[PDB]
Amino acid sequence: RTVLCIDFMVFTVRLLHIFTVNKQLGPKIVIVSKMMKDVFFFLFFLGVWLVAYGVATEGLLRPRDSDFPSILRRVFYRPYLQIFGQIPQEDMDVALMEHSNCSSEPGFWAHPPGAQAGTCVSQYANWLVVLLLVIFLLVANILLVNLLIAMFSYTFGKVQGN
Amino acid sequence: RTVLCIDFMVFTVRLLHIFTVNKQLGPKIVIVSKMMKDVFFFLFFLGVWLVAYGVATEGLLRPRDSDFPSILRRVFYRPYLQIFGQIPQEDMDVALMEHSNCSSEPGFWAHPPGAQAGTCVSQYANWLVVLLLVIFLLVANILLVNLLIAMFSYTFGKVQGN
């Protein structure tokens, strides 16, 4: 069933051939195929930045539910969703959490209400977590996307004639 | 631990050197380094606008929890997050709050359910707070970002050859 569910996407992608017959949108489909270089440049930069930011934030927070799937989720999936307006402040900012001594280790800890956000996180450098979130929003949500738009426009204008 | 968490980002940034060897994306990385002027222009304009809007809104609302970290948060952090779809209407619009006489000072006050949004805010010119929010969304979410995209495209087309 899973293989067939993916195969449905593979089959439905074939419908793009219909609009290669139009005189106006025929050039567009063949221009689009030239944008993969820009797409992969964006993907490489995004992967590097996501690795850096996610690992730094996960190291700063030190959640107790440090299972490997949870580590990968909080490193990659959550910062990726932060690019699309899904910013879980209650799972990162300690001023919005409840302060409790759940952890046996010395220090101060707080309980995030998220299901996969860890049982408790540390309060030592939460202002730095907030600053890292600010810089992540500045770079990923603005610099990379605007740069990709610029590269798309440049490639379109360069390759439309051919 | 905090220093090492930042150092991990510093180290991971070095992976960008890998794609300076590609014949197609090699020019892209050196074009990107020319965009810092546009980035800093955007940052200066954004800082000026955030200062103005945040201080005006904080002065209009007059929350009772006027601690200095809270003042800085409600002036800078919240309006910055409003650029990325995080608009806390329940903390700014008085029509969505509960009306109670918590404040001893004369006037009308309401209790925002936000944790760091102040104990109670004033109801005098809330329509002006809403109008300021409208103008902030018009300027920051549209004018500045579209202008930055235009500047990025212009610089890309100007400096690709060199």
UniProtKB/Swiss-Prot annotation, chains A, B:
Q: Which residues lie on this side of the membrane: Cytoplasmic?
A: 20-39
PTM comment:
Phosphorylation by PKC leads to increase the sensitivity to Ca(2+).
Q: In the UniProt annotation, what is the result of changing Q86E?
A: Alters the monovalent cation permeability sequence and results in a pore with moderate Ca(2+) permeability
- Superkingdom, natural source: Eukaryota
- Segments traversing the membrane: 1-19, 40-60, 129-149
Q: Does the entry annotate any disulfide bonds, and if so which pairs?
A: C102-C120
Residues modified by glycosylation:
N101
State which ranges are Extracellular (membrane side): 61-72, 94-128
Question: Where would I look for the motif Selectivity filter in this sequence?
Answer: 84-86
What ranges are intramembrane per the record? Answer: 73-93
Q: What is the effect of changing I142M?
A: In EKVP6; increased calcium activated cation channel activity; increased keratinocytes proliferation and differentiation; no effect on localization at cell membrane
Q: In which tissues is it expressed?
A: Widely expressed with a high expression in intestine and prostate. In brain, it is both expressed in whole cerebral arteries and isolated vascular smooth muscle cells. Prominently expressed in Purkinje fibers. Expressed at higher levels in T-helper 2 (Th2) cells as compared to T-helper 1 (Th1) cells. Expressed in keratocytes.
The record's note on quaternary structure and interaction partners says:
Homotetramer.
Which illness does the annotation name?
Answer: Progressive familial heart block 1B: A cardiac bundle branch disorder characterized by progressive alteration of cardiac conduction through the His-Purkinje system, with a pattern of a right bundle-branch block and/or left anterior hemiblock occurring individually or together. It leads to complete atrio-ventricular block causing syncope and sudden death.
The record comments on the domains as follows: TRPM4, is a temperature-sensitive ion channel, it adopts distinct conformations at different temperatures, markedly influencing where and how ligands interact with it. Decavanadate (a positive modulator), ATP (an inhibitor) and Ca(2+) bind to different locations of TRPM4 at physiological temperatures or at lower temperatures.
Q: What does this protein do?
A: Calcium-activated selective cation channel that mediates membrane depolarization. While it is activated by increase in intracellular Ca(2+), it is impermeable to it. Mediates transport of monovalent cations (Na(+) > K(+) > Cs(+) > Li(+)), leading to depolarize the membrane. It thereby plays a central role in cadiomyocytes, neurons from entorhinal cortex, dorsal root and vomeronasal neurons, endocrine pancreas cells, kidney epithelial cells, cochlea hair cells etc.
Give the family from UniProt.
Belongs to the transient receptor (TC 1.A.4) family. LTrpC subfamily. TRPM4 sub-subfamily.
Record-given protein name: Transient receptor potential cation channel subfamily M member 4
| Organism name | Homo sapiens
Q: Which residues of the full protein are shown?
A: 892 to 1053 of 1214
